[PDB]
Amino acid sequence: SWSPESWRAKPIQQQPEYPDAAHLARVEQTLAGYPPLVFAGEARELRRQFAEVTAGRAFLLQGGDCAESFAEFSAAKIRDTFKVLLQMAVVMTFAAGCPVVKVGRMAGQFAKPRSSGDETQNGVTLPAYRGDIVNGIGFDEKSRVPDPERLLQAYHQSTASLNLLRAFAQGGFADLHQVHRWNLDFIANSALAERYQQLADRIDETLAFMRACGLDSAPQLRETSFFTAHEALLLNYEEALTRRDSLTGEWYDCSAHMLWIGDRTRQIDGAHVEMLRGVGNPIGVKVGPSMDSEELIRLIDILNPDNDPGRLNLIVRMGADKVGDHLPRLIQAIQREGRQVLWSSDPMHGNTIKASSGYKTRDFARVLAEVRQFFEVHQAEGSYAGGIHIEMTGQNVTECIGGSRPITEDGLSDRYHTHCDPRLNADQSLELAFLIAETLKQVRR
Amino acid sequence: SWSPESWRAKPIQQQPEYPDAAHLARVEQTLAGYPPLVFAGEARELRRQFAEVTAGRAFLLQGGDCAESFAEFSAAKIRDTFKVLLQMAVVMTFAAGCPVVKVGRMAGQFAKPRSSGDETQNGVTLPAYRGDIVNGIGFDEKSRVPDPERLLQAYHQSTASLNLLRAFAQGGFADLHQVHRWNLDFIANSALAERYQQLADRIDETLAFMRACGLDSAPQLRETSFFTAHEALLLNYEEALTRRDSLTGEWYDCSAHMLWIGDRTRQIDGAHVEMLRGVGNPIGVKVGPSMDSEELIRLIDILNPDNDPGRLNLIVRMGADKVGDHLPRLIQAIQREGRQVLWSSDPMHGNTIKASSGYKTRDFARVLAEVRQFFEVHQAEGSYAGGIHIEMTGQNVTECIGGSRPITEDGLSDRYHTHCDPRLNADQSLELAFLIAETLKQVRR
Amino acid sequence: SWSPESWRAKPIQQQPEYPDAAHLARVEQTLAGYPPLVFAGEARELRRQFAEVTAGRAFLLQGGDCAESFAEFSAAKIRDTFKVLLQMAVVMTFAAGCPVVKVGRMAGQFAKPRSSGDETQNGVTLPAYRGDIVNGIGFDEKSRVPDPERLLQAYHQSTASLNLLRAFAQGGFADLHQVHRWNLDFIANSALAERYQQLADRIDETLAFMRACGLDSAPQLRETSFFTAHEALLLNYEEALTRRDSLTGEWYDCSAHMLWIGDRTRQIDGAHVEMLRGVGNPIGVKVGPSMDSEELIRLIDILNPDNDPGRLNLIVRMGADKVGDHLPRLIQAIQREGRQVLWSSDPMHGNTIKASSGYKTRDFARVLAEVRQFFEVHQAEGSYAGGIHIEMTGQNVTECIGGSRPITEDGLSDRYHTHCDPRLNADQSLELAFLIAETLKQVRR
Amino acid sequence: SWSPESWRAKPIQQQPEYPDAAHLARVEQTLAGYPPLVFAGEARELRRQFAEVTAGRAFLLQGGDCAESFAEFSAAKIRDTFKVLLQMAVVMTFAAGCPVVKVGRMAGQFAKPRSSGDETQNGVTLPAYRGDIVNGIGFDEKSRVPDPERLLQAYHQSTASLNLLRAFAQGGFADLHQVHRWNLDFIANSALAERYQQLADRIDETLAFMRACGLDSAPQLRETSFFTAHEALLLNYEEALTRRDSLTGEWYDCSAHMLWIGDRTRQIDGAHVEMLRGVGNPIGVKVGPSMDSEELIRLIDILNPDNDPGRLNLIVRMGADKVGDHLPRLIQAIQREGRQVLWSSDPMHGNTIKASSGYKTRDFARVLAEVRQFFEVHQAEGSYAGGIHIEMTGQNVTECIGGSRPITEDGLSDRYHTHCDPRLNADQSLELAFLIAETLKQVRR
């Protein structure tokens, strides 16, 4: 049996050490009485769309921030990231004839898991930066001491962001007639921009023809659903935002539509798995090179006992060099055991190079190579390459090398070469979308 | 005041001389108690679509036989002609973003007006062939004597043909997923066929995208309306099939959705105008080189006194050499007097050459030139080039010269070089449709 | 293996003796080249709706003439009969929340099976009247001698009637806003009329609310499909109108959407079964008191070998006194053998009394009692009471006794007390519809 | 010319005195960079729906809190209030055949205008309570001193509330199949509950019939738009949340879809009018007994110079005794000057009795009487009674007397008898909705 607090009896990784247990417990009670970010009905609806993807009838697009910050809390940033998602989605939808389920790493992607629990600079040692929901990026004691009030500031940033996203998605901004306005102005003067603009023209023509057929007022052309997801890492936050469905009594983590377990916190006897075990949300697990096939099946026994087809997303991040070698055996096990899973590629977290200095690089060529091999492996095994899961930005930067143009080492993107990881820019997100699109067309031909 | 028989008190052209007035009157009473081909509601609906065309928001496609015959009464022929109409319609609809109103010269286009009321072969003189509804094509007395029973045979051919057309249109045959199946198998191995096939592919993609958007079950994609029209020439037929609307009391000629007055029977004091004066149908008049602008306005005063915008179609057939010279002055008059009319081009009946032998030729190059000039003239005057009105066939023939390939002088098409006129084949209908389509796109750009 | 003519090698009942085999063969060739009444696509669509009924997700309404006549060939009669069908359909649809599949015994219900092959009046003996498609009702030699030309007159009446029905159904007459106009003016001044008028008001309110919700332009509210059916009795007619589907090569009897085998012609080794064996249409068989359960299963093996769920309608006509006793055993056999069938009640042909004089009576109370027991029997056995199959008229008569008002013995209805059977009038059809409606609501509650 | 800060140069009522101008200015800059509650596109859409109401084709329902509080910030409270709004809306929509535009006094209704700028208790005098966005209800210095940080707490409560409302409205909670679940469990055991339950049953039947017609998947049945409104009283808040539309450059107050000017702050030369003058939102003005017809027209010249038909809502709150006397002359002036306005009744703020003690009472009988007279007055003058504007709650209380049951003087509702006003409960909101509904039906009959 399970409760929202049953995770507290399990062994646990990646949790901060709060200096005042009582203070933390008061912030948790405050948050427990605040309204949920999502309504349980919607999580059920996302499960229904996951099941469509799992059965080969749609494709999952999951994208957004590496970690949202308090210092970057702007309408512009939320809008631009959502623009890139819509662009990708329409490119894939039109070229492949395939519904795309859109899920943003947004409105609650704050907590960060770290390779080390502390950090050392010239003889001074401080707790590690774990994301703004926990503590601050500044290398100094007041910054790094965990502050339970940050829970509430993360929540407030999240209701603001999701409120705006829901407005954009339902209120006209995502209407297919807006197809051109989704292109950020810095995608121009290149074969790729020309390419989007031509596809957009084709969409204009499609809608004009639908209008001439008598379908101009269909609500389906004017609005779309956008869902939210983050890593369920800080379980105090997740617990306070877990709520019983009014109609059914069943527990849902209402911090987000979908939650996932990170690669370093997926211990089968651990707290993170125990949390997600007993919520009704669609969920995901990060599947990196350390996962073997026995371990994977046991994990699925726990996270999806009834083998429901819209429950579990397996998010494969292996490295461009390792996916060929590791994935086949994992799929084969799932097929053999008759499991229903949604297979996604995270082509980014397995392709990060750390220099001795701590400076992080991601070669976009390797990101593409992992993706291409993901699809090849599915192709060979008879299973379905079901989704993509990327870190990206609508800001005019270049954080991943070996793209089309050389990188920007801005300072605005220094956070994304040290404490966070390099994100795809809009050029890169779009080229990815076109590659996915051709590949999907070929699968379905 | 007006009745279905008020035409009988007017002077009249092009009527046959029946040998037994009483016998004719009995066939007329028989036909008067038979069911109507169309229901008044539908004629009102066509008026509504005419008004859309008249206002520049749609385009009228009217096509079919020169004159239907009793010897060519086959499902195959009806289907193939309707295929060509759907092809044309979709080509225009997709490329121009414009609804097309589809009207077939079918299910009652039997009566034919003739330049002479008799015919002479080597010293023997016989009444002229006036179409199978009147008499027979054979040069012999029994054939040429008007037979009132032929009224009923025309009616029976008409209910059969329209029944089938309504079945095709509503029952799945006209569903947009059928776009490829409308291409007749003899349109192939040419840039034009390649062109239709590419447009059809674009339509497949549009529908697949609509499916992926959640619109796959829209009834608008699956069915279309098809309307019928003929020249109201034999007024005995027309009267017997004129019926009062159940709800409103108002008279409708229920032989067809739309009726038109031919160029030789449009005398303002004449029977034909008097007939159509008092029916509620959408109607048309043939406007050839002999029409002046004073005459045209008076005709419109009679045929559309209330200046209703879906009532009157002006069907301009001038000759490739004469349209430039004649049309401008006609449009200018209408504009000046504020009249609402639907302007169509009949590019065929003004471009017929009669050799001394009676053998008829139509150069397709001239057909295209009249069309191009029609649009140019509208362009120059500020008015709307609203429709096309052609004779065509889905049979694998070539009756009009100077197309892409040289003609067929079959014998199957000898009727269409003597008593009837050469029809456009499917290649020719399609090239026309593509020209119309580019022109409409340019008008609306 | 099967052909359209393979029935001619089988033993056969109820066929007329034509006096000139050659003449008959010429009329058959004429008819073979005439267009079909229906298109194969539509027959497939009706199979799809039958499958919905068979699975308990819709209800089948089949109604129309006992036998159409040449003397009663009027738009008014076709319209009024169709009005009664729409009335019944909407009453059932609204009160029961259940789609109704609408099938008219119209546009080809001409041939009649007879208890005797001749008739005797005061010493003179003549071939029996077999319906106007064969011969004439007049007791005299010229009338009664089979005339093959009557085939063509039946065909022409059929294209006229179906053309009009398709017009009504698609062209605005069947639009749900017309709900009141379907009530014939002689249903008034009674609790039953009041009842329809209230339901119609409820439908007005429903549509107004749909309009206020933004659904006013849905095509689903404006049009409906209407299908046709008759007894496939005169196989010469049926063969000439059997045609290969263009796309699939497969044979369809295109005289009508659905054909059925009568109770007296359902010999398993016989011609009628052999005809329908190899057409793709939805079909029916009349199941009267003489049918046993072994015989029924063998018949189904032949008529539906693949056990397709939209293929076969079993039309049960037992008598009010006999249904209780006979039906249970028939259903039990079907259930046991896993057969997919659409069960309908014909509550009329088993409830006819013939006086010594030949004068036919049908007590409406018995018609209702057979219906009520049909549903009771299904209720008891676990199967689905799937449809109703009645003879009815929109004319202002009373042919069945023991209704609400006493009968009309008009002369207009003397055909329906001798050579044909008494039909339900509109009062009676409606009361039936309300009973069916309550019963269906209760089944689904 | 106009800017978001141009109000600061005008004379102004009802503003608090902040103790630190600099601190306030910092909180304002913080809020200025936070995301907007609404997107400009949506405000334009609400203008479009206002225009529908103004033209007599819809009805405006505006309801919610008197003033939201920080202590009552729960999902339950937001949900229950929204339930009552949906109930009212559907009752009106179904019975009257009329679209209802739904606007909640929610997600930013914090600031309160007061009759006096201070309050005295037993010799101690303190600044008046102006709502939680300004200061605190507690009678003590720290509470009553204006705190600029409260701006941000109001904003955070607002994004949380609107995020949830948008979720409910779009995500399944407002789906018409939920009609029964909107009834709060304490509306039961009464003719009024029975009444809602019967209407809900009628809605079930309507949807079942739509399903049987093939419309079960229409998005229009599943989602609705919900808009937000408050009094634009604290202009510092409003300015910080005023933002330029991305596409058009035009300014919108993005704190809410609609803003209104209160009765005490509508000075034509004043700050409040100057603020709303130059935003693109739909807006309202409170029109109480002190407004004369000259004054009203000048106010409209300023607030709607172009006389756009979806711009201005006149919210009439006169008193049950005074509406008869005052409104006629106001309407007559508007009619005479050809102004397009949306006329609403606020039947509550003119019907409040203050005892010498400060204890506030509202007699529901008087609330109903003002409403009834509003409609009567419109009826007499030829204008349109366009909306209703009420304070209400989904909590199980009785704050207004003379309803059906005697009041609750809870303490939970003591805020609503002193600093705020008594709200309608759910019984009362519903009875109102049924009265409005009959009245609208009668107007449109």
Ligand SMILES: N[C@@H](Cc1ccc(O)cc1)C(=O)O
């Ligand atoms: N409404 C459809 C199609 C759609 C997709 C994306 C959009 O931006 C807009 C519409 C969907 O959500 O799938």
Ligand SMILES: N[C@@H](Cc1ccc(O)cc1)C(=O)O
């Ligand atoms: N139903 C639409 C679109 C359409 C057009 C042609 C078709 O063949 C099919 C559908 C119309 O009639 O305009």
Ligand SMILES: N[C@@H](Cc1ccc(O)cc1)C(=O)O
């Ligand atoms: N179009 C739907 C609903 C309908 C039924 C009957 C009608 O008369 C009209 C509409 C159908 O055919 O089932």
Ligand SMILES: N[C@@H](Cc1ccc(O)cc1)C(=O)O
């Ligand atoms: N979607 C429609 C109808 C509707 C109304 C209220 C609802 O709760 C649901 C649907 C509208 O917003 O007007």
Ligand SMILES: [Cl-]
């Ligand atoms: Cl699931």
Ligand SMILES: [Cl-]
């Ligand atoms: Cl008109």
Ligand SMILES: [Cl-]
């Ligand atoms: Cl089937």
Ligand SMILES: [Cl-]
């Ligand atoms: Cl406006």
Ligand SMILES: [Co+2]
């Ligand atoms: Co990362």
Ligand SMILES: [Co+2]
């Ligand atoms: Co011709």
Ligand SMILES: [Co+2]
């Ligand atoms: Co019978």
Ligand SMILES: [Co+2]
């Ligand atoms: Co108040």
